[PDB]
Subunit: 316 residues, 4 copies
């Protein structure tokens, strides 16, 4: 099943045995990168799912064997930012990986024998931030390149083929659950009020259909909350006048962008507390533990070298 070195390396990747991870990796043994436990653990997914930044850095140093897609979906599926910046600095990125032109075949950084598929066999990596409304990740993605599928309503060329394949329409309502959350339309492309006011007529035309109804009604609710929240955070008369309707308009829009984003980040920081955040704090404490103890052992090794030098001097 599992050798001794595999269990050492996997518990090291779990619990922040960072110098032990070093002394396992820089030894040239048959290290067997991508060892999987009873579930999909993959020795890197554990490092992402437990806030181990430098372990992910050391694993991305070895670009021989990896599974980067589930790693990025873990790092976005929770509120991590540093791990996302570490994963995006990789030669399988930087205008090498897009989302629009893609068949049903799987490949590198598309999960197969996955630990978990997030939400579908055809599922973009810019869909996970918007369902979670994580803003800074969308800054990073749209600053790279806006990754939106630009969904289409029945062209019937190859869309009818995928309609005849399987339950694609769940992914259709899911793709419309992309385009109307707070974070992307608060960051997409200017005159946000125009796009916000062109959404709910389209989702009511979706409500002409009768399959996924209440979800689209909730999307209309979210659009209404957007409109009211944009009407709330206004002080002077000109703010209200251009919320009702050149350079000053774009300045006022950027001001309301800043206000809505910062009040959304305040509203995220006034909630209850999940246990995963305490899991992250415990892993921080354990990483401090192993780093400080084994670098103190390195200090004792340097003192032993100095003692050997002094003993060689005293023997002389």
């Amino acid at each position: 099943m599992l050798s001794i070195e595999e269990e050492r390396f996997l518990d090291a990747a779990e619990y922040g045995n960072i110098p032990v991870v070093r002394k396992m990796l820089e030894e040239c043994h048959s290290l067997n990168v991508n060892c999987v436990d009873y579930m999909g653990q993959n020795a890197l997914q554990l490092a992402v799912a437990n806030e181990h930044l430098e372990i992910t850095e050391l694993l991305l140093k070895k670009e021989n064997l990896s599974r980067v897609g589930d790693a990025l979906l873990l790092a976005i599926s929770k509120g991590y930012v540093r791990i996302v910046e570490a994963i995006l600095n990789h030669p399988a990125f930087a205008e090498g990986k897009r989302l629009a032109t893609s068949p049903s075949q799987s490949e590198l950084q598309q999960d197969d024998f996955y630990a978990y598929d997030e939400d579908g066999t055809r599922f973009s990596h810019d869909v996970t931030p918007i369902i979670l409304a994580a803003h800074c990740q969308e800054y990073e993605i749209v600053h790279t390149l806006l990754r939106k599928g630009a969904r289409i309503e029945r062209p019937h060329d190859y869309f009818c083929k995928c309609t005849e394949c399987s339950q694609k329409q769940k992914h259709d309502s899911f793709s419309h659950s992309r385009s109307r959350i707070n974070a992307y339309k608060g960051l997409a492309s200017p005159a946000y009020l125009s796009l916000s006011s062109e959404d709910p007529v389209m989702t009511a035309l979706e409500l002409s259909n009768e399959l996924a109804v209440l979800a689209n009604i909730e999307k209309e609710f979210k659009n209404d909350y957007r409109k009211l929240s944009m009407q709330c955070k206004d002080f002077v008369v000109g703010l209200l006048d251009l919320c009702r309707n050149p350079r000053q308009y774009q300045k006022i829009m950027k001001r309301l962008i800043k206000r809505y984003v910062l009040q959304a980040q305040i509203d995220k920081e006034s909630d209850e507390v999940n246990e995963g955040e305490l899991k992250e704090i415990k892993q921080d404490i354990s990483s401090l533990r192993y780093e400080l103890l084994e670098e103190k052992s390195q200090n004792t090794e340097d003192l032993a070298e100095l003692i050997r030098k002094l003993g060689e001097r005293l023997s002389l």
Copy 2:
């Protein structure tokens, strides 16, 4: 009542005085392992109930005097995993201790003059994980050997004798509260839908009796939540078709196992916060405190040795 060394050793076992625990244990005094305070504290139960992993390792190094049963029931009664792996690596385990063939007599790793009996004088150690739905501990136990009592409904050979003894039927309803929680039937033996659908008829036949009624009704509720939750996490048509009803079936079942286990672990990590987790964090901080301070004292001792060597050189 208590000597000075006993109070030192007990507060050391409480609060993570790990090098003080070392300098007490490796001295060959009359150390009096298994000293008990005002309640059952036992100098090891404090280490388990306060997240002190290395103290439990050092105490399991001395296999002279111990009380392992309450230690394992503490380590499973809370969400500890490392302490469970430390306790199970012990010569009172590894196919040396089973659960089925057992009389009413107590023995080693069966608590007597206990700090606490968990739920009964005849109570298996694989019952505590399932009431708490801790998954990884059940992976470890069933990977050792599935430990289920395989309960029986009135054979009247010796079961009638224990019926005439005492209130065994509370333990009967308790033993049926084992077999229907999420974690074990999500991990027992394949075609989980068959076992889940054979449960509620049997618990309705229990509802023919009128002693413990609402508990069995709640078990039927939990089975219904299982069935609906298994119907939720499906995407393609074949998933729904084999949830409705060879190799592909077993693959689809393992996929749904992975999905349900990971969404259950996400649902555990989105709750409120008990104070015992902050107790664990405070004990982590205190363990860091004592480790770093007294190993820094060891560093000063090494520098004092180097100073004595340099003074002996300068005197020469």
Copy 3:
């Protein structure tokens, strides 16, 4: 108002500048122990109210000037235990300070120009644990000596004089709010069911009066919760039989003591989280900060001494 050394010493007593507290105290300046800020802060009350154990130890080393009563009432008014054990090891204790024979005059370890009076000008120190139901502090106190006022109902010798003085009857209902909470009657003196069943008739005789009514009704509720909770945690028939009514009786009573105390400590550890616990965690982190940084500065001082010795050797 405040000199520079006073502000240094007060912020040191707040935030865990433990070696700075050392280098202020062991210097023989006019240190002015008991400096008070804008409110009652007293340079020791800050150490108690912010979890600074070693600072309280160093302040109790200097027994020249102090204010111990408010310190003990802070340490009991929150859930501290180590600070209580540190304060009780003091020559103003250990059968030197009692609670029954006491006039209205204030003295040492009775607060005057206090930061705060807890609940009254005549208020025992064993009343604060029972309102908070902190168990281990009551173990320590009753193990020293049970400190109960043994309240009396209208003797009219000097009780009528204090009745004619002021609103003593608020303290009368408060003194009856001592004697019926979970922790003391779970730890007072055996046959707890007898005392629990003799309480509510007496509090109904208090309900014959009409001043503080709903409080006494709530005390009767708490007594009912006690009786039902004692009826819950029973397994064998003999437990129920002696809960209904020699050596085995005392054994069964001690078993139910252990069970009720441990389930009460579990029920305390499953609640929501107040911000004061995070204040304690932040003060732990700051204490680690200042200890590790300034003892690392001591290590650099020792290395500078070794460098001076090596330079004196190389000059030779």
Copy 4:
């Protein structure tokens, strides 16, 4: 967009790279203080909004380029105290900056191209503590100088001009939301009951107007809660008599000040937990990480110097 040193300095100002902040600042490069990211981040606002006290100290050491107004509004908008004391020790303060005599023009320590305006283009810095009811900050401010606008009801000299300018009346109701919260009237100027009883007639005269009604009704509710809370915390008859109506009166008022402030601080410390406090704890852990690791690297540098000295001795 951003150079390499700018990204290094900004992530250092975020995450507590305190010796890296030192080695960036004390190098005499074109460091570009006040670099702004995608939103207003300003390299100091990140240090304030993430609990980095020594980074704010090092940034206030360089008084060349700064933005102090948003820094103080961040430090007061959350519950920080040490950062407020660090910011107020600055030559743009100490009776150099007032609040009453001020036109509509912006200047130093008045935000422009701000990250965020808190509540208005004319908004005093003593308004943020009272809406948050932070007590110690108001002690510091009123101990400097009470900063209240002393609002006026229609003088029509220049007040009518600002009435004709814009929506000033939102700031009028906001300025009345200053003067009636718990913290300031619990700390303003004696006979608090007189001011508390002169408030609600004035806010009912505001309720003669019909624009902001329910807010003023809530202010009357808060005044009623004040009056009832002051009536609660009384024990002797004289306390009730002077709450109903010389030296003893002022003593009793100061006693009730102490009692109400300390019970308000207890009521703040019994709430649920926001995630921003865990953000502060994570930043404490990361600051400990970088400090201890890079000062341990300094210790290794000192040992390397000692090794070079010993090698020069052994070569001799």
